[PDB]
Amino acid sequence: WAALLILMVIIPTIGGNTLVILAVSLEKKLQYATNYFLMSLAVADLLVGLFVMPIALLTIMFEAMWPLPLVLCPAWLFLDVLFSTASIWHLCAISVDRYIAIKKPSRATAFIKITVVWLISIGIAIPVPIKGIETDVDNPNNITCVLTKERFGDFMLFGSLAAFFTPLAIMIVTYFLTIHAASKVLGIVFFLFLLMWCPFFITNITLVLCDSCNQTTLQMLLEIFVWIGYVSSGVNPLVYTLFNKTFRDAFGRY
Ligand SMILES: CCN(CC)C(=O)[C@@H]1C=C2c3cccc4[nH]cc(c34)C[C@H]2N(C)C1
Ligand SMILES: *[C@@H]1O[C@H](CO)[C@@H](O)[C@H](O)[C@H]1NC(C)=O
């Protein structure tokens, strides 16, 4: 069925990230500090594909029924917010980097940047576990693990504003600023991949701010769009790494 095709699309997500990290770790001619930041995208996307996606596939297979203990329901959601957000902000840093380069003419700076990005992601993700889910029964086989509008109403709005629209505005500004000052074929196409997450957040804000909209109608659209988001997140690092020819030569070696 569709599950086989979905699994055949998940396998590349694990494959590409491990290929990228193997390319970085194996060779020494690609050891410049800017690749250390790409390592963060590689590991984040690898973790997403390894953990989040299979749970979603089983949630599709077993109809809205949790196949795991109750305690795991919040934690999974926490991870679903921790890694995905961590991806998006990373892209923003790349834009900033290019800006600095355009106005330019060490390892510590890269480590500081990575740490700051990850702390921002943790801060955004940490509201979820502390305020847990609410259910009428204690049996995991009778419940559905979905964030509700009533329990999380302000969190969804502010998390969508912080995680998506702020970095989006930052890059929209920095692109024009760079143009008012290799850089074109890459940035234009590598930032349009972000667009593939916009429909999820637009629909989420619509659900937050509409009191006369059919919730059931919007829920199916959200479920459809979330998978497109995962596809974009998984495909971005391979698309980036294939641009260089040294990476293409290295990949075939092992
Ligand atoms: C289809 C249902 N699911 C999965 C259970 C979601 O809607 C997830 C909810 C997310 C979410 C909500 C609210 C704020 C947010 N910031 C960052 C994310 C986020 C990530 C985002 N993940 C990717 C999908
Ligand atoms: C609730 O879980 C029990 C498990 O014993 C199952 O038999 C029952 O059909 C479930 N109720 C539903 C799915 O409405």
Residue-wise over 8-46: b if at least 16 C-beta within 10 A, else e?
ebbeebbebbebbbebbeeeeebeeeebebbbbbbbbbb
Q: Which ligand has the minimum distance to the alpha carbon of residue 66?
A: 2
**What is the rounded CA–CA span in Å between residue 125 and residue 158?**
12
Least Cα distance to 240 among 5, 6, 11, 24 occurs for 24
Question: Which residues constitute the domain of residue 109?
Answer: 2-253
Q: Which ligand has the minimum distance to the alpha carbon of residue 208?
A: 1
Instruction: Kindly report the three-state secondary structure assignment for every residue of 175-235.
Output: HHHHHCCCCHHHHHHHHHHHHCCHHHHHHHHHHHHCCCCCHHHHHHHHHHHHHHHHHHHHH
- How deeply is 200 buried, as exposed, middle or buried, from its count of CB atoms within 10 A (0-12, 13-18, 19+)? buried
Token look-up 């949790």 returns 66
85 is annotated as contributing to ligand binding: yes
**What is the rounded CA–CA span in Å between residue 211 and residue 144?**
23
Least Cα distance to 42 among 234, 186, 175 occurs for 234
**What is the rounded CA–CA span in Å between residue 118 and residue 125?**
10
Supply the CATH number for residue 177's domain: 1.20.1070.10
Other Cβ atoms within 10 Å of 115 Cβ, number: 10
Distances (CA, A) of 144 to 65, 68, 232: 5, 11, 26
* CA–centroid distance, residue 88 to ligand 1 (Å): 13
**What is the rounded CA–CA span in Å between residue 172 and residue 96?**
11
Give one DSSP letter per residue of the chain, joined into a string: -HHHHHHHHHHHHHHHHHHHHHHHHH-STT-SHHHHHHHHHHHHHHHIIIIIHHHHHHHHHTTT---S-TTHHHHHHHHHHHHHHHHHHHHHHHHHHHHHHHT---HHHHHHHHHHHHHHHHHHHTHHHHS----S-S-GGG------TTTSSHHHHHHHIIIIIHHHHHHHHHHHHHHT---HHHHHHHHHHHHTTHHHHHHHHHHHH-SSS-HHHHHHHHHHHHHHHHHHHHHHHHHHHTSSHHHHHHHHH-
147 is annotated as contributing to ligand binding: yes
Who lines ligand 1 at CB under 6 A?
Answer: 80-81, 84-85, 156, 159-160, 163, 222-223, 226, 229
**What is the rounded CA–CA span in Å between residue 41 and residue 88?**
9
State the structure-solving technique.
cryo-EM
Q: How many domains does one find in the chain?
A: 1
Q: Which resolution, in Å, applies to this structure?
A: 2.7
Region label for 133, one of left (φ > 0), alpha (ψ between -120 and 50) or beta (otherwise): beta
